[PDB]
């Protein structure tokens, strides 16, 4: 009966991994969307 | 084997009917004594001090000969496959015991130098020591082979405390429990019989633990793959075969070295003939004694004959 439960456990592990990846995805996106007001002070403000 | 059994009598102290009768036509024929000898003097002999030094070193020479004899009789025979070298195969100085003891031809240039034997005796002793060292090397090789023998095959034949992978069934583990229903697919039966297998499954540890060690008698773990056990058994068989071959082929070389040691002992007896001649007669080597392995009655008769030079 736990043969099908193995699939459920694998699905739960994959869902947890995907949830962690998505949670870090917002931070990764904000790492570039934000703080570029500082990097533009060197990329173009130097000009 | 047999220790030294040579008689002591110079040329001037022959115990036979005549001085030259020691070799043949002696009264020993009537008593069936196997005594026989043949002269083989060296080129020259040392002085009185040299004779005394040789007599002193004769004790060490006899000790070395005894050590070689003990090694040859023990290492070869104990292997139960090296004692195949008979008297002819182990002939001393190229002649069997019938002829080796009847002559001193071993005094040729092989072990000694066919020269004043004061240092030639030491040289022959060193050669015999080298031969004994080779025999000891062969014995050590035989011991290492026996260490290779009694290998992993000495363990149990599977489904037991040791080497149980040979009887493995190859979520499950090698249990072989010698004298279950749950969510897990416990409806199974492994091939772990050399023993018995029980219903178990890795999906839920309840059935697996119950079958393995939970109740009754705990099972014995073993390697999962029987290929490793088969390889270990094959290696053990190969090591046993190699040990047997060494006891039959390398120990055949050991038996050849034992025959060489017998030749060295014949040379030592030839030297001891001249040593006794110097001790109880003049310096030049000349002896009329004999070397054999007679019975008690024959030795007593020889002593009665030679009582003119008793100790």
Swiss-Prot record, chain A:
GO molecular function terms attached to this record = proton-transporting ATPase activity, rotational mechanism
- Keywords for this entry? Hydrogen ion transport, Ion transport, Transport
| Superkingdom field | Eukaryota
A cellular component term, taken from the record's GO annotations:
proton-transporting two-sector ATPase complex, catalytic domain
**Segments traversing the membrane:** none
Function recorded in the entry:
Subunit of the peripheral V1 complex of vacuolar ATPase essential for assembly or catalytic function. V-ATPase is responsible for acidifying a variety of intracellular compartments in eukaryotic cells.
Q: Family per UniProt?
A: Belongs to the V-ATPase E subunit family.
Quote the subunit structure annotation: V-ATPase is a heteromultimeric enzyme composed of a peripheral catalytic V1 complex (components A to H) attached to an integral membrane V0 proton pore complex (components: a, c, c', c'' and d).
Which named protein is this?
Answer: V-type proton ATPase subunit E
Organism classification: Eukaryota, Viridiplantae, Streptophyta, Embryophyta, Tracheophyta
Q: Which residues of the full protein are shown?
A: 12 to 58 of 230
């Amino acid at each position: 009966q736990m043969v099908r439960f193995i699939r459920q456990e694998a699905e739960e592990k994959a869902n947890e991994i995907s949830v962690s990846a998505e949670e870090e995805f917002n931070i990764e996106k904000l790492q570039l969307v934000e703080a570029e007001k500082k990097k533009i002070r060197q990329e173009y403000e130097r000009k | 084997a047999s220790r030294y059994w040579v008689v002591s009598l110079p040329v001037q102290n022959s115990a036979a009917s005549v001085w030259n009768r020691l070799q043949e036509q002696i009264s020993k024929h009537s008593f069936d004594t196997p005594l026989y000898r043949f002269n083989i003097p060296n080129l020259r002999v040392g002085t009185l001090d040299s004779l005394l030094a040789l007599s002193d070193d004769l004790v060490k020479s006899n000790s070395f000969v005894e050590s070689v004899s003990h090694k040859i009789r023990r290492q070869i025979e104990e292997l139960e496959r090296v004692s195949g070298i008979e008297s002819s195969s182990l002939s001393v100085d190229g002649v069997p015991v019938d002829t080796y003891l009847t002559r001193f031809v071993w005094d040729e240039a092989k072990y000694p130098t066919m020269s004043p034997l004061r240092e030639i005796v030491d040289g022959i002793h060193t050669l015999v020591a080298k031969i004994e060292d080779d025999l000891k090397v062969r014995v050590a090789e035989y011991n290492n082979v026996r260490s290779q023998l009694n290998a992993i095959n000495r363990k149990q034949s599977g489904s037991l405390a040791v080497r149980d992978l040979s009887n493995l069934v190859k979520l499950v583990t090698l249990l072989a429990v010698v004298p279950t229903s749950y969510v897990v697919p416990r409806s199974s039966k492994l091939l772990y019989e050399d023993l018995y297998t029980v219903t178990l499954f890795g999906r839920v540890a309840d059935n697996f633990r119950i079958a393995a060690r939970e109740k009754g008698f705990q099972i014995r773990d073993f390697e999962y793959s029987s290929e490793a056990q088969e390889s270990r058994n094959q290696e053990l068989e190969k090591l046993v075969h190699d040990q047997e071959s060494l006891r039959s082929s390398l120990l055949q070389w050991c038996y050849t070295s034992y025959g060489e040691v017998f030749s060295s002992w014949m040379h030592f007896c030839a030297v001891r003939v001249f040593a006794e001649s110097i001790l109880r007669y003049g310096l030049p080597p000349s002896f009329l004694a004999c070397v054999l392995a007679p019975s008690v009655k024959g030795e007593k008769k020889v002593r009665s004959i030679l009582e003119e030079l008793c100790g």
